[PDB]
């Protein structure tokens, strides 16, 4: 999550729904209307880097973020059913980082517990896949397609470590 | 938006980082994203002009306390995001260049920018200078692999011809094997002339 | 002059410094350059190091010990030293 | 960068092998390096030279494992098999692991690497057949892997204890376990007010 | 019965370069494992370098004598030992330079900060300090000519904390790192106040993780995974060595 971290930059660039708590003339560029003043109660998705700051500051905060479908209770129920079967990458490549940022902006113990359980199950599956080494598979391909980009990087690191260890063991 | 170009540049940086992590051997780095960088710089100049206009509006005094403050804050945040993206991409490319200099220059100019090429030359000069002086006894450019094998059979991957040794000249005639200490043949292996006996 | 005596010295001073191949004929040419001074020319050792550095800066070519280019580089470095004097 | 990306988090198996080589090992010399009162010398700056210079034929002596293997490359050196590296000791460790699924058998942290290196080189020195020792090592590795799977099922963010686990196993598990525990700790910290 | 072990011990009682090499190995391992840069041991490094120089000179003299008993096996042993020692020293120095470049901004901040307990020269070697200064200056010149000329002067500062993510980068104290409890540096377990009896007669060292405010005891001669910040106290005490 570094300042120069490209993945963190992309996750911050991701937009989230929000509802305006203020009416600001001259902010029509965010509205995408050249001369229309911003209005209170207006609903507009905003980039996470800007939406989070607007939710933090404003006293009444300047904007209030609406709950995303990635944070929807239906997605939560699907995760509680089967953490592995869900396509977290299709939902968001930075879904875990976005969940962590949403927990930081709004402390949610149950959400953190559900996210941790999903991460643990997906990590067990990813560890099984990484332990499976060549002496592309459809099952691993579908699992990676479900797996987010960060989880795929972790899986690549673990699988490369296992493959290097096996190669060094089987070769002089 | 203005930050979208920086996001695209950072996406290219992440793609190149994943590629370099995938390939152990150093590939010729992707050509510098001069187009996206120049677009981001033009956006930064436009935002600077907008900030100057906002300061002029503040001198006019209309809503300078709140509306102009928010507009200037938004423009400054956009400039900061663009600068962060550009710095991240440049740092990743420069780290790749430093790794390449440690790999080869210690023992694809079109892809690099001219400033990047000057920086890589300066890094190679710095490596040679660090080896040239204190701690010169150990070749800092020498391989980081532990000396697992004192002696190893060596033969030419290529017919380079005569080659120097500590006290000998060895012909590298094609497919000519040898039995020598690994340390002396480490430089020749780095040259690629001899591979695995 | 004393190419065998300078051979380990030239090998170290060049190959350890830059990774550059030193041909035996080039070592012999450097020996003749050293023998151009009647006595041992220890300062000429640093002069040869400077010549190798200038050759790496200009030609930037491996196998500089072939001495076809190294003799001209030696003349160039000698002229540079004369200008320095 | 100066450090390879894979090396940023964990030591390589070759590095673990280098550490195991830094460990010492007993061997039987075949050269009377010791000179009678009636010669080249090691003069090692990082290790004892007196043992090497006092070695005599068939006089058991201990030296750093790398130097021991270097001498074993010559016919002069024959490495002494570790006592725990015996069929009876391996069977005892296997029975201990079977009786204690929670508790790992008290094998050395470099037991796996040392057994592999000895099978590569010191297979001749083993009085017991090398195949039986290899099978026992594989059985112990499988038991330890099952125990590691159970422990991963029982992970905790606060801490973990692995007493008798092999150093190679710890090095292999460092990336995955460290990343998972760090992610869990980050989730718990974000949950914390 | 009467115990005369003390009497027998009293009757029995009537700088090692190898130990320095072992200390260098432990220090290099701790430097590789620890995100924070370790303080530079100048005396030990200089003694090892002098020993390496003398060994190389002796090997060269032996080579001259051979070119003029005659057994090159000890010479090969000395050459391999010198190669291994030089490789270890170079690896430690390269890791130190990597840490210096990773925290160049924080190191400039620490050098500027008189309140910082450790002087930059104290933490680094002289060559390390010169390298950090020159590298930071070159990077600052490049970044300034690249972007700072167009950037407004209020935001032109490279190391400023005004950004939401501070541009200065510092080692992660709280990062988890594996460790094996070395036990007390002294032979006597009771002599170490940190060492204390735990259940089943096991000496242990009490430790606390500030984030959870949890207190735990680390048995001597045992391996554990803990945050580097809490581990740093025992590491400075040398009671535990990073894996």
Tab-separated table of N, CA and C in Angstrom, chain D residues 108-163:
chain	number	residue	atom	x	y	z
D	108	UNK	N	17.293	-32.707	14.013
D	108	UNK	CA	18.001	-31.440	13.809
D	108	UNK	C	17.312	-30.608	12.739
D	109	UNK	N	17.424	-29.284	12.878
D	109	UNK	CA	16.789	-28.389	11.915
D	109	UNK	C	17.293	-28.641	10.501
D	110	UNK	N	18.541	-29.082	10.360
D	110	UNK	CA	19.104	-29.431	9.063
D	110	UNK	C	19.072	-30.933	8.807
D	111	UNK	N	18.121	-31.652	9.409
D	111	UNK	CA	18.067	-33.099	9.223
D	111	UNK	C	17.805	-33.459	7.767
D	112	UNK	N	16.840	-32.788	7.136
D	112	UNK	CA	16.503	-33.100	5.749
D	112	UNK	C	17.658	-32.767	4.811
D	113	UNK	N	18.231	-31.569	4.953
D	113	UNK	CA	19.323	-31.155	4.077
D	113	UNK	C	20.541	-32.044	4.283
D	114	UNK	N	20.848	-32.370	5.541
D	114	UNK	CA	21.991	-33.227	5.836
D	114	UNK	C	21.792	-34.630	5.281
D	115	UNK	N	20.587	-35.189	5.427
D	115	UNK	CA	20.317	-36.510	4.872
D	115	UNK	C	20.429	-36.501	3.355
D	116	UNK	N	19.909	-35.454	2.706
D	116	UNK	CA	20.009	-35.367	1.253
D	116	UNK	C	21.461	-35.248	0.803
D	117	UNK	N	22.249	-34.414	1.486
D	117	UNK	CA	23.650	-34.240	1.114
D	117	UNK	C	24.429	-35.531	1.331
D	118	UNK	N	24.174	-36.223	2.444
D	118	UNK	CA	24.852	-37.487	2.705
D	118	UNK	C	24.464	-38.545	1.680
D	119	UNK	N	23.189	-38.593	1.292
D	119	UNK	CA	22.781	-39.514	0.238
D	119	UNK	C	23.473	-39.175	-1.074
D	120	UNK	N	23.678	-37.883	-1.337
D	120	UNK	CA	24.395	-37.477	-2.540
D	120	UNK	C	25.857	-37.907	-2.497
D	121	UNK	N	26.507	-37.781	-1.339
D	121	UNK	CA	27.942	-38.025	-1.240
D	121	UNK	C	28.309	-39.129	-0.260
D	122	UNK	N	27.796	-39.082	0.970
D	122	UNK	CA	28.219	-39.988	2.031
D	122	UNK	C	27.426	-41.290	2.052
D	123	UNK	N	26.816	-41.672	0.927
D	123	UNK	CA	26.047	-42.913	0.888
D	123	UNK	C	26.931	-44.130	1.127
D	124	UNK	N	28.196	-44.069	0.703
D	124	UNK	CA	29.101	-45.197	0.899
D	124	UNK	C	29.416	-45.411	2.376
D	125	UNK	N	29.581	-44.325	3.133
D	125	UNK	CA	29.997	-44.432	4.526
D	125	UNK	C	28.941	-45.079	5.413
D	126	UNK	N	27.680	-45.083	4.990
D	126	UNK	CA	26.608	-45.612	5.824
D	126	UNK	C	26.741	-47.125	5.959
D	127	UNK	N	26.885	-47.600	7.200
D	127	UNK	CA	26.854	-49.038	7.444
D	127	UNK	C	25.483	-49.615	7.118
D	128	UNK	N	24.421	-48.920	7.516
D	128	UNK	CA	23.087	-49.294	7.089
D	128	UNK	C	22.909	-48.970	5.606
D	129	UNK	N	22.110	-49.759	4.889
D	129	UNK	CA	21.886	-49.468	3.467
D	129	UNK	C	21.246	-48.100	3.283
D	130	UNK	N	21.670	-47.405	2.224
D	130	UNK	CA	21.208	-46.039	1.996
D	130	UNK	C	19.723	-46.007	1.657
D	131	UNK	N	19.211	-47.053	1.002
D	131	UNK	CA	17.810	-47.061	0.591
D	131	UNK	C	16.872	-47.063	1.794
D	132	UNK	N	17.199	-47.838	2.831
D	132	UNK	CA	16.359	-47.866	4.025
D	132	UNK	C	16.343	-46.509	4.717
D	133	UNK	N	17.504	-45.858	4.808
D	133	UNK	CA	17.562	-44.526	5.402
D	133	UNK	C	16.771	-43.522	4.575
D	134	UNK	N	16.840	-43.632	3.245
D	134	UNK	CA	16.069	-42.738	2.388
D	134	UNK	C	14.571	-42.943	2.581
D	135	UNK	N	14.136	-44.200	2.687
D	135	UNK	CA	12.726	-44.464	2.932
D	135	UNK	C	12.261	-43.945	4.279
D	136	UNK	N	13.088	-44.119	5.314
D	136	UNK	CA	12.746	-43.590	6.630
D	136	UNK	C	12.682	-42.067	6.611
D	137	UNK	N	13.603	-41.427	5.886
D	137	UNK	CA	13.588	-39.972	5.772
D	137	UNK	C	12.328	-39.507	5.056
D	138	UNK	N	11.929	-40.221	3.999
D	138	UNK	CA	10.697	-39.874	3.297
D	138	UNK	C	9.481	-40.030	4.203
D	139	UNK	N	9.446	-41.098	5.005
D	139	UNK	CA	8.332	-41.291	5.930
D	139	UNK	C	8.274	-40.177	6.970
D	140	UNK	N	9.428	-39.805	7.529
D	140	UNK	CA	9.463	-38.715	8.500
D	140	UNK	C	9.041	-37.399	7.861
D	141	UNK	N	9.464	-37.161	6.617
D	141	UNK	CA	9.061	-35.951	5.912
D	141	UNK	C	7.556	-35.919	5.685
D	142	UNK	N	6.964	-37.059	5.324
D	142	UNK	CA	5.517	-37.112	5.132
D	142	UNK	C	4.775	-36.852	6.438
D	143	UNK	N	5.252	-37.439	7.539
D	143	UNK	CA	4.610	-37.217	8.834
D	143	UNK	C	4.706	-35.748	9.232
D	144	UNK	N	5.887	-35.148	9.058
D	144	UNK	CA	6.055	-33.735	9.379
D	144	UNK	C	5.202	-32.852	8.479
D	145	UNK	N	5.028	-33.236	7.212
D	145	UNK	CA	4.177	-32.466	6.311
D	145	UNK	C	2.715	-32.532	6.737
D	146	UNK	N	2.255	-33.705	7.178
D	146	UNK	CA	0.885	-33.815	7.678
D	146	UNK	C	0.707	-32.964	8.930
D	147	UNK	N	1.700	-32.990	9.824
D	147	UNK	CA	1.642	-32.147	11.014
D	147	UNK	C	1.625	-30.669	10.642
D	148	UNK	N	2.393	-30.288	9.618
D	148	UNK	CA	2.414	-28.900	9.168
D	148	UNK	C	1.066	-28.508	8.578
D	149	UNK	N	0.416	-29.431	7.864
D	149	UNK	CA	-0.918	-29.152	7.341
D	149	UNK	C	-1.913	-28.924	8.473
D	150	UNK	N	-1.855	-29.759	9.513
D	150	UNK	CA	-2.733	-29.553	10.664
D	150	UNK	C	-2.443	-28.220	11.349
D	151	UNK	N	-1.162	-27.878	11.498
D	151	UNK	CA	-0.810	-26.609	12.115
D	151	UNK	C	-1.276	-25.414	11.306
D	152	UNK	N	-1.174	-25.505	9.977
D	152	UNK	CA	-1.712	-24.457	9.117
D	152	UNK	C	-3.225	-24.364	9.248
D	153	UNK	N	-3.894	-25.502	9.445
D	153	UNK	CA	-5.315	-25.467	9.772
D	153	UNK	C	-5.560	-24.769	11.104
D	154	UNK	N	-4.591	-24.818	12.016
D	154	UNK	CA	-4.713	-24.215	13.341
D	154	UNK	C	-3.845	-22.965	13.486
D	155	UNK	N	-3.793	-22.136	12.447
D	155	UNK	CA	-2.983	-20.926	12.488
D	155	UNK	C	-3.609	-19.874	13.401
D	156	UNK	N	-2.756	-19.006	13.946
D	156	UNK	CA	-3.189	-17.915	14.807
D	156	UNK	C	-2.334	-16.687	14.532
D	157	UNK	N	-2.974	-15.514	14.533
D	157	UNK	CA	-2.263	-14.280	14.217
D	157	UNK	C	-1.275	-13.892	15.311
D	158	UNK	N	-1.549	-14.272	16.562
D	158	UNK	CA	-0.721	-13.821	17.675
D	158	UNK	C	0.709	-14.336	17.553
D	159	UNK	N	0.872	-15.645	17.382
D	159	UNK	CA	2.194	-16.261	17.324
D	159	UNK	C	2.029	-17.723	16.930
D	160	UNK	N	3.164	-18.400	16.770
D	160	UNK	CA	3.201	-19.834	16.527
D	160	UNK	C	4.529	-20.372	17.038
D	161	UNK	N	4.541	-21.657	17.381
D	161	UNK	CA	5.741	-22.318	17.879
D	161	UNK	C	5.973	-23.598	17.091
D	162	UNK	N	7.174	-23.734	16.533
D	162	UNK	CA	7.583	-24.928	15.793
D	162	UNK	C	8.949	-25.340	16.333
D	163	UNK	N	8.955	-26.278	17.281
D	163	UNK	CA	10.177	-26.589	18.015
D	163	UNK	C	11.150	-27.400	17.166
